[PDB]
């Protein structure tokens, strides 16, 4: 499930949701591309 895999990634592979400080262009790209294409 998507609870053990996340825990496995943290413990075994050292994952952490580190903050990504994005430029306005990068912030727009992630927010707009979730809606569609044009």
């Amino acid at each position: 499930t998507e609870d053990e895999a996340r825990r496995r990634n943290w413990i075994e592979r050292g994952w952490a949701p580190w903050e990504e400080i994005l430029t306005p262009e990068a912030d727009f790209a992630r927010k707009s591309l979730n809606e569609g294409e044009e």
């Binding site: 430029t23 727009f28 790209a29």
Partner: protein, 49 residues
């Protein structure tokens, strides 16, 4: 025969605005390639453009 149509380098006429248009397309491609490297557009968007 009497008119004697021919063909020289000078006769191969390009329209006056080609240099302006090619330079504009080059500029837009250059800016998009930079922002592709920054992660602002994805590879398919660069391909289409």
């Amino acid at each position: 025969t009497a008119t004697s149509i021919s063909l020289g380098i000078d006769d191969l006429l390009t329209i006056p605005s080609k240099g302006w248009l090619v330079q504009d397309a080059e500029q837009q491609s250059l800016i998009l390639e930079k922002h592709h490297h920054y992660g602002n557009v994805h590879a398919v968007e660069k391909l289409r453009q």
